[PDB]
Write a protein that binds this ligand. Structure first.
Ligand SMILES: O=C1N[C@@H]2C=C[C@H]1C2
Ligand SMILES: O=C1N[C@@H]2C=C[C@H]1C2
Lengths: 175, 175
């Protein structure tokens, strides 16, 4: 019995500013959430507490809004499963398939989606609904755009025995 | 009781050719393995069977050589723990800390090191002893060099409760 859950990670006012394609990604994530709501697909929100619990920066970035009855999981690390209520929350919902949108592509999203895969979930990465910022290391710059693209490349070929991984845009993903 | 194990991933003749800094990375991985051997630190080799089991491409890339008594784990997926004897092998050795070198940075290395973190290991990524190739996706090119650099950036800040993650060069890593 496949049950899909939309998992929206760290889409917070203090996280998304300055990210690649910021307005576009936030708009498509919002559309995805609305599509899920209309289809009766559960949405689970994840917030990174070190952004500053109790501050406006911690709250959802516009135009995102949490609806009544939608779980919210708070975390202190990149992995949304690490020392959190996520697994318990997903088990209570009977989730088998996670549709992931959020930020940042190379940190919380990267770590959570691979953890999800390791735990045995089917996972769909929403290719046009995650983002991050430009960075540089070891004397080379890597743009947010490159990281998003490389992230989608990686996920499109990800495989685990008995598990299914799908890459799709926000308007194509099967909910 | 911290026990360090050097985990050398997919350093195969059919994998490394064309990779960024190919000769350098292979030479430093070899040096690391020799340092580990001299220090009595166990080395565990991982080979990707889909490279072509029984073919020369599957075997270790020069100048790497496996020593007597060094375990070898065979796998079919990016995650070296997925449907393999890795965990059993590491448990038998009492491993608590994994020092990771190998290829490719963005596939088998990326997936194995994050899985290792999820499983609860302390992990050290050997910053100058992993590599991959240039690629492109969504109309943007990302060089092997950029992927290696971004991989090291990611790992340097990785955190889990009660776990330690270290980034260090092959000649600096504590064995
Ligand atoms: O990807 C991410 N989301 C939170 C802010 C930075 C990391 C943690
Ligand atoms: O990183 C990697 N090592 C093997 C060849 C490609 C992936 C699997």
């Amino acid at each position: 019995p496949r049950r899909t859950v939309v998992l929206a990670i760290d889409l917070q006012a203090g996280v998304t500013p300055g990210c690649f394609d910021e307005e576009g990604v936030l708009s498509r994530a919002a559309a995805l959430v609305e599509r899920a709501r209309a289809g009766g697909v559960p949405v689970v929100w994840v917030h990174h507490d070190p952004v500053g619990v109790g501050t406006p920066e911690w709250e959802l970035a516009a135009p995102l809004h949490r609806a009544e009855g939608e779980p919210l999981v708070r975390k202190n690390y990149r992995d949304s499963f690490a020392d959190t209520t996520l697994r318990e929350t997903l088990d209570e919902l009977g989730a088998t398939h996670l549709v992931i949108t959020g930020a940042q592509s190379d940190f919380a999203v990267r770590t959570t989606m691979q953890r999800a895969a390791a735990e045995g979930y089917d996972v769909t990465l929403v290719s046009d609904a995650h983002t991050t910022v430009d960075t540089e290391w070891e004397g080379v710059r890597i743009s947010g755009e490159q990281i998003v693209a490389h992230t989608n490349m990686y996920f499109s070929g990800l495989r685990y025995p008995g598990q299914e991984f799908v890459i799709a845009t926000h308007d194509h993903v099967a909910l």
